[PDB]
Subunit: 797 residues, 2 copies
């Protein structure tokens, strides 16, 4: 409120002291001034820097306002208020302080007054407006020139909208659909409509996606999991791929530049010159429209590492604000690398915890988002690295060097979190995860863990989940289903039956392996208290093989990632069904058509929550590449042409199976099935094969009202005759048979089958079903429905 001394300019009035809360740029409700607030415990000086867009493009600042360190600062939070500020300016911060390479008494200090760094709380960011657009060709690294390189030009943050109104939600609320009801579709914003066949107005944008959303409503999906939509740099490592005319993009976006700003290069409007805040409203429009169609939005989020990399990466934000607070560091200043990406965010140090939590609440409150999937979630359980606060000489006024550079170490010099835990140690009770799990703003927000990291920490089945608040990507489900369905000796039959049940062997298991450290110690308290809906089941996802390719290649084919690449999963549990890649051998193609459906049957006929990889609903292929992370091409694009074509009726199959699952409450459970819910069979009723050599799993599943389903997967290379369990006064009726050419693979009424067609196809087999016999082809899958016995069935149609 008081003036802090800095003079007015053409763009704003005399600066005021301002307030530390809220962090970020906000409008003062009293004066209308923009209050600016940014944390840094390590900075000696801080300047607010403002840009016109032209100045920003040119690598030049328009205005600089030095903050008074006595008046424009409260504790570790710097703050200043600028009244009557031109609201089309953009902002950042020049932060001066020590640097370890210029004084080694200060490991972990990495200030650079030549940089202008981004407000971590930036509501929208501008740097480059169009996807793939290179930044300007400035003489970077010279006096007064802002930005790092053409791939990393100067970014700036948008100001709060002073005049004008907010977005009209029209009563929109997050849907709060019960977790167990979900069918999740993993999609990429750009890849969903970037392909020419998409036919939309703004290909590859938030606005483009809205235009094709009816597809996903028609497909029967009720949740979309978006790949990272937080601002990232797709030109991060832009270079020509060695031995190829293609260029290397960071396509997927698992390398976040700013966590509060939506990705501008997914915004049609920003691409066309709109103000940077336009992307905010384009994303709000998208969520609104997903909700109109009964589709939840789950954001994939990456709080385990940032785009700044290690010391050889760019100073964009955290590193130049306060490197010691934001990143996991050893006492020399080296970056712990549990993320496998160069740095590891300091998740559980207090300011960082608050940042992440504020970020999640921001996306829920401002964008009405329904859930978060946390990439490499194990990192969020690890103890942070602490440093003592900087000492200053009262006489000299000067900074005072400390023992071990002020790293809080053990007697053996090992980094510690300040409270006795060695840095990196996985916590039974991580404060961040507890905060996420218990914050009231997030209480109806779904939380999904990918419960491992890149240093071999694996917490699946015992992520700290605070009373059922977290589901987990179930990678065991993926490997089990792939092994069993291709036909593989081992324990895969038993393991598969368990997967059908929602993997209670993983989520309700209270007898950990003797060698599993986590499950025996920190994870033990978390080994129960969850039902099947904690298992996010998937057969494929953005990384790894597609469904089609899983059934077409024994080995990966990542040549397009560049000569001398060592990219992608080695152990794929795949089978090419006879020949590597495309082939005219008919028995191969017959088998692939079947195994696509068998794998999908497994996914959507299991308790827990199925996730579908974009494109696997129509047999999308990446030509055997199991790691398309760098390709801005058809390999990562939804192929609207191939979808229309549906040559062997697979998209119809998937679509109908989705809808059939949604309509079957016995598959959508919050408690595990018991011996009265499900019974196991073989070729004979109640005689399951659990042996190493098993090639058959089959089960009945009751609907609670006397009806129910019979399901069987024959993974044998031989055909089988099944004896069906006899239910008094009832017969089994055909629905799914993967041995049948489409549309008779799925006998449901639709635009292709009439109610007559279906009844006729049921009556055809009436002699087989009445006998309680059903013939099944090798590598095939059956679903039957129990119906009231009607002896007139076997008379004339």
């Amino acid at each position: 409120c008081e003036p802090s001394g800095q003079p007015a300019s053409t763009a704003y009035g005399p600066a005021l002291t301002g307030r530390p809360a809220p962090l970020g740029a906000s409008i003062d409700a009293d004066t209308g001034a923009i209050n600016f607030s940014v944390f840094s415990s390590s900075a000696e000086s801080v300047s607010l820097v403002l840009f016109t867009e032209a100045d920003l493009n040119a690598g030049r600042a328009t205005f600089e306002i030095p903050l008074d360190p006595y008046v424009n600062r409260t504790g570790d939070v710097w703050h200043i208020m600028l009244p009557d500020l031109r609201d089309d300016l953009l902002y950042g911060y020049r932060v001066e302080g020590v640097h370890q390479e210029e004084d080694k008494d200060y490991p972990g200090m990495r200030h650079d007054k030549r940089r202008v760094v981004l407000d971590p709380y930036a509501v929208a960011v501008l740097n480059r407006r169009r996807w793939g657009q290179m930044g300007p060709n400035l003489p970077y690294g010279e006096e007064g020139v802002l930005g790092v390189m053409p791939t990393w030009p100067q970014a700036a943050a948008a100001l709060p909208a002073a005049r004008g109104s907010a977005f009209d939600w029209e009563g929109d609320t997050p849907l709060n659909l019960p977790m167990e009801s979900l069918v999740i579709y993993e999609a990429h914003v750009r890849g969903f409509t970037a392909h020419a066949s998409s036919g939309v107005a703004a290909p590859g944008t938030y606005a483009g996606m809205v235009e094709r959303l009816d597809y996903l409503k028609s497909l029967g999906v009720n949740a979309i999991e978006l790949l990272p939509v937080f601002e990232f740099n797709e030109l991060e490592y832009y270079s020509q791929i060695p031995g190829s005319d293609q260029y290397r993009f960071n396509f997927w976006g698992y390398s976040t530049v700013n966590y509060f700003s939506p990705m501008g290069r997914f915004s049609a409007a920003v691409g066309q010159g709109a103000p940077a805040r336009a992307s905010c409203d384009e994303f709000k429009q998208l969520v609104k429209e997903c909700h109109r169609r009964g589709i939840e939005v789950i954001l994939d989020v990456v709080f385990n590492h940032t785009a700044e990399g290690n010391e050889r990466g760019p100073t964009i934000s955290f590193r130049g604000l306060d490197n010691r607070v934001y990143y996991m560091l050893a006492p020399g200043g080296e970056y712990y690398n549990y993320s496998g990406c160069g740095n590891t965010l300091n998740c559980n140090q207090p300011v960082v915890r608050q940042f992440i939590l504020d970020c999640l609440k921001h996306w829920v409150t401002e964008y009405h988002v329904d859930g978060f999937r946390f990439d490499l979630a194990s990192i969020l359980t690890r103890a942070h690295s602490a440093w003592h606060p900087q000492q200053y000489d009262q006489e000299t006024g000067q900074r005072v060097a400390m023992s071990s550079g002020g790293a809080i170490v053990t007697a053996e010099g090992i980094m510690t979190d300040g409270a006795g835990v060695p840095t990196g140690y996985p916590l039974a009770d991580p404060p961040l995860v507890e905060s996420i799990s218990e914050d009231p703003v997030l209480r109806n927000t779904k939380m999904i863990a990918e419960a491992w990291d890149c240093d071999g920490l694996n917490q699946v089945g015992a992520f700290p989940h605070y009373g059922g608040r977290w589901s987990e990507w179930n990678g065991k489900f993926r490997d089990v289903v792939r092994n069993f369905i291709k036909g593989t000796d081992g324990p895969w039959a038993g393991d598969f039956a368990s997967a059908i049940c929602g993997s209670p062997n993983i989520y309700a298991n209270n007898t950990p392996h003797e060698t599993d450290w986590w499950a025996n110690n920190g994870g033990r308290q978390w080994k129960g208290g969850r039902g099947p809906h904690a298992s996010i089941n998937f057969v494929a996802a953005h990384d790894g093989f597609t469904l089609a390719d899983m059934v077409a290649y024994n080995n990966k084919h990542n040549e397009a990632n560049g000569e001398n690449n060592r990219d992608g999963e080695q152990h794929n549990n795949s089978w090419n069904c006879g020949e590597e890649g495309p082939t005219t051998k008919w028995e191969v193609n017959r088998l692939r058509q079947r195994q696509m459906r068998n794998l999908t049957g497994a996914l959507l006929l299991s308790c827990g929550v199925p996730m579908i990889n974009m494109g696997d609903e129509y047999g999308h292929s990446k030509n055997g590449n199991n790691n398309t992370y760098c390709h801005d091409s058809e390999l990562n694009y939804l192929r609207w042409d191939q979808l229309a074509e549906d040559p062997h009726g697979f998209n119809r199959f998937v679509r109908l199976l989705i809808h059939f699952r949604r309509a079957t409450p016995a598959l959508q459970r919050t408690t595990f099935v018991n011996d009265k819910d499900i019974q196991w069979h073989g070729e004979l009723p109640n005689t399951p094969d659990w042996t190493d050599t098993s090639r058959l799993v089959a089960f009945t599943l009751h609907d609670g009202k006397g009806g129910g389903l019979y399901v069987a997967f024959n993974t044998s290379h031989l055909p089988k005759l099944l004896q069906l369990p006899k239910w008094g006064g009832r017969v089994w009726q055909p629905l799914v048979d993967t041995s049948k050419v489409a549309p008779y693979d799925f006998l449901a009424v639709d635009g292709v089958l009439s109610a007559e067609d279906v009844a006729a196809a049921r009556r055809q087999m009436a002699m087989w079903t009445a006998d309680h016999t059903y013939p099944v082809l090798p590598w095939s899958c059956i679903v039957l429905q129990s119906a009231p016995e009607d002896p007139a069935a076997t008379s004339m149609i």
Copy 2:
């Protein structure tokens, strides 16, 4: 000279009688004069009178006129004859024959002349007596002086005069069709049964003309030959009486008891029932043949030359007994009737006059009625040597007949009767001159002959009936037995035997390693053992006698109580299985199994080489409630049920119809030579691995079409289902057609009023992953027929 008056005066109805002529036998129009010549054989008669009737007189048991023939003028040798000019056309005729009777003089055994009777000319062109089916004859004081006729069920009969000159039937260019035997599919039908039911909806139910109105059904069914049960005049009231414990009366319904061989059964004629002259039955029958021929349907007459309606000595004297008993019937030296027929008498088939009679009869039906074939009831009797007597000798002065040693019976030294040429009477001849004549007569050379090659005294000649160079086909009783057993699932040689049956029974008609103890096959039969194709085999699973097709899958044993004889009558061993319960049931699994078994039996019948015969009603599931011998019932038991047919509740009639047409479109099944290892190949659950063991429950085969294609057929008769591995023919795929596991209409995937071409294509693509794998699942007690098509990989893409 034939025209010189023989002495007998004119009457109000004819001119003075003339000498006449011995040939032709019967009553014929002299061309020039226009007078009626009468000629009848009798070697043993002392006196003959032509007797003439008005129908009123006939019905009142009285002659209208009588002309005694002069023995020295109106006779040449053993043929009595006389000619009547200006004969009135309302008159019918018979013969009063006088001579000796063994009851009155024991010196003349075999003689049974009775002058109280007026007998029927065996060559009668039409017969009149009772004009309505089941109408009892008039109440007359029978047995009393003056009155003709035996009893109300055997009233006086009489023969119609020949048709007047210049009035012949208009065939409109009709000829016998002369279809190749191997192309036939035969339908065994009863004229009255065909339309007697209320549901027939025809103008004249139970008649030749009634049958014409429904011929279309047969053409549409896909049949090209109808085999009519005995169409020659018989008496349906011959043993008329109430059946012990019923409201129904005993009839001779089927008609295997012939009264006159030259005359159509009058009570099958709508016209006779409506009061037309007796010859009306002739034109009505001709019309029927013409109508059959128009539709490409051949006509085959069941004929019963092994015995007659006159029975033994206790039977009625209607014709042959009263004319020349020693000639016409097979007799022992004491006058006893040989009974190889099991019916009281046995016709003396091979004696010369009788051979002439039988030949003349066959040519009559062929020439005058354009008939295409004959099926000989108990045909073995036609191979048997006859009874011979020396000619009667008379005292040249006295005149009196003279008694002879043994009654004039030509006997061995031990007293056994003989045929005159050293063969003992009854001996089955290798070369019976009757059969030789039937086989070689040029008028009959395009006429099909079919033998029921057994009789009722244990003689069996199947595989070796004297066939004169393949001129005869045979009812293959073995086919029936083998098929029945195999299909119901039965341990033994049945799989192997069933495979032989499929091939048209070469193990019977082609081979010649006769069975150790079979006397016929080792002797008279031996020259007949080979030289025939599969077309010699008439295959059947059922016939008018025995169970219907539906009753075979619903009954372990016969239920003939309603025949009055307390279930003693009928076949003892039917090789039937009730599919889990005796009679009508509510048990779904039993009813499922019958629907299949009915089709599997029919498939066996129509997917085998040889000539298949279908029994009327079996094409829709006709039942006689477990009665395997409905010989005596004039009721719905023996009537084509048009109401049940129209209903077709599990689509069985569609199945049978489509399979007949399919067979007929499949030249590989219609052969005059036997298949070899190139024409057919045998399989099991694995290709080329058939099961011929005692416990086998699977016969499967491929049949080439000689155009690169062909068929896969398989019969699983096991109680378990099976997965068949089909043989791989390079560049080709097996396509489904017939699968009795499938509920109709998917039991037969051919286009028709129910399945469109789209539906058929769709149903085939459905199975395309299975057939491409050369894997086919089959239900227990099921049958499939697959067709080889060229490989198309597009089949496993989306249907439409």
